[PDB]
């Protein structure tokens, strides 16, 4: 498996009173490990897993610094945004950013990226080529020309191939004995009566890490989706995940339906039958 280091950042202009809040969250392989949060009095980056607490005192000094920088720019970006879109003056708005790296297990960069969204929608995104931008709309074109003029693209490209890789690799080593673990899902099928002589079979997957999984119901013919409800993968809140997938069957015909669970923490894929 490849791995990622991603930062997800949010700026929210509060209506009348308040100033913008600002939040900076970073994730190694989709596990949170550092957070920064504007509302605190003691606004500081902080460890979010046990293995980041082991880190050189001045790591934080450094990261906190950058956060205040970015915080300040956010305030300004929000005001800029407002003027690009000619928006009514009184409302609550949002700027969000994501950037990070996925690198293979051989240690080479796979994809680097950085995207901004305004009020929940795509604004601008660095292209996979790491040197051209994609504007989502006419306001973002203003920024794109700014960033083209400011050589922004080169600075991000340098960080993505530079600091992020180096640090990704370095965070893995730190919490190496946890982010690499693999818990396999425990599955069962439940049964439920239904109006008209219909039956909900529901296929459960519990206790798995990492989150990625595939639950499918096959009517002995491999393919099945028509009338097949499944929920988004959800955290059980102990480090593991949960998911289920249900299907409705004519009463009497339960045995014809098999559930299949694919997950990387399994010797081999489970099949289940009521």
């Amino acid at each position: 498996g490849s791995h990622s280091l991603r930062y997800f950042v949010t700026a929210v202009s509060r209506p009348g009173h308040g100033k913008p809040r600002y939040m900076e969250v970073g994730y190694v392989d989709d596990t949170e490990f550092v957070r920064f949060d504007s509302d605190a009095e003691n606004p500081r980056y902080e460890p979010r897993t046990p293995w980041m607490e082991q880190v050189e005192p001045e790591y934080w000094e450094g990261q906190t610094q950058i956060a205040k920088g970015n915080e300040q720019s956010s305030r300004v970006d929000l005001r800029t945004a407002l003027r690009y879109y000619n928006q009514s003056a009184g409302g609550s708005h949002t700027i969000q950013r994501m950037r990070g790296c996925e690198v293979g297990s051989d240690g080479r960069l796979l994809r680097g990226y950085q995207q901004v969204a305004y009020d929940g929608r795509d604004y601008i995104a660095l292209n996979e080529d790491l040197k051209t931008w994609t504007a989502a709309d006419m306001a973002a074109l203003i920024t794109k020309h700014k960033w083209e003029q400011a050589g922004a693209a080169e600075r991000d490209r340098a960080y993505l191939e530079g600091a992020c890789v180096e640090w990704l690799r370095r965070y893995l080593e730190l919490g190496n004995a946890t982010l690499l673990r693999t818990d396999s899902p425990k599955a069962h099928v439940t049964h439920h009566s239904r109006p008209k002589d219909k039956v909900t079979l529901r296929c459960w997957a519990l206790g798995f890490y990492p989150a990625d999984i595939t639950l499918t119901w096959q009517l002995n013919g491999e393919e099945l989706t028509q009338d097949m409800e499944l929920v988004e993968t959800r955290p059980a809140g102990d480090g593991t995940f949960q998911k289920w997938a249900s299907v409705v069957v004519p009463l009497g015909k339960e045995q014809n339906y098999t559930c299949h669970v694919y997950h990387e923490g399994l010797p081999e894929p489970l099949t289940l039958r009521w």
């Binding site: 920088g69 300004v76 970006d77 700027i95 920024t143 922004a152």
Partner: peptide
Amino acid sequence: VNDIFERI
């Protein structure tokens, strides 16, 4: 580690 973000 995170970096500085360009202003939009």
